[PDB]
Symmetry: D2
């Protein structure tokens, strides 16, 4: 698996558990088409979204459902969700980790791309 | 000025100048409709996107064109752009500052909402 | 105003008001000597810490008292404080803004340095 | 091992490899005393700093040597280092991960405390 998502909670100092994540790929007609989805584990990680066979070059969007996460914790959030948009390029062997750090009114995202 | 955008460059420790920003608002048909756009100034700020009259309740997307910013500096970055999605003016008018802090493979965004 | 400090609260999406800040400068004996201090205003900013005359070359530490800020809000945070350590004015005078974005278990700090 | 350090590089989109990390504990005389140290691995992680026996309650400082990291990559940095200061409390079983995300003029740190 070439694409992993990891989410942390900056208020509790914990992995962000049970966060829904939806991945889309841009189609030929320029629309976002569903590609993969899941919920983060107890470690805040989401593994097994795709395979090397299916994860071809293209433009992808990883949407982290931040609003539902904060509401389930009884906390008042700002954003609807956190979308992370990027091109996947076959510049040799690569693994992509989309990491995100969440606060109710702020978030950061980092791409960790390794060989 | 109920909606302002501020962008900083984390590599240089400076305002991110001439960054293009496109704002959209979700329409009744659920599509993203163009709402306003502009570019950041020498201070990294973008003022005058809208007015209290035009900035009605709704779901908005502020898209910061991070890829074009890094490419104009001769750098190949990871993300296509940084979209920031939120509901605005649902409890009456507020002033919103959407701030972003950019690095080639990472960004943070914060909302500062004042009454 | 060659040294300014700005602090935001990532939980509320607001300026962090009344945050204590202590600045130190490394002395010849390698100890941290008090240099200036103050508290952030209603805008989350702290102005007037020093003057161009007093702000000589040196190694400085800007300590943001994050624990006292969260405790005054009735929250038990992780960090004791957020120290920001850097050399200043080594290539002539510059204006420095030390910005910090706070959450109970996490913070970010950015330096904006202008000539 | 109850204390782990993880560092990412926001410019390259990679683990921050070979970063020196120095941990100190506050002594009875209020001075910072060396406690443990090491360099991050190829995964950007530093394991085996201490043991449950030695990691008693107290005030600790984890110093990440950011300036030397950026200089070894041929990149111009702002901060001397990134110090992370906190109390370790035996509120039941706990593991502490000090995570940091580095850019030349900005960094973030998050504490992930799990049971
Ligand atoms: Na406006
Ligand atoms: Na000043």
């Amino acid at each position: 698996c070439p694409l992993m998502v990891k989410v942390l909670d900056a208020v509790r100092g914990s992995p962000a558990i049970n966060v829904a994540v939806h991945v889309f790929r841009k189609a030929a007609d320029d629309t976002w088409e569903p590609f993969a989805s899941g919920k983060t584990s107890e470690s805040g990680e989401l593994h097994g979204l795709t395979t090397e066979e299916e994860f071809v070059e293209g433009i992808y969007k990883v949407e982290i459902d931040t609003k539902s996460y904060w509401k389930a914790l009884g906390i008042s959030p700002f954003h609807e969700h956190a979308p992370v948009v990027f091109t996947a390029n076959d510049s040799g062997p690569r693994r992509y980790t989309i990491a995100a750090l969440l606060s109710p009114y702020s978030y950061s995202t980092t791409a960790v791309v390794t060989n």
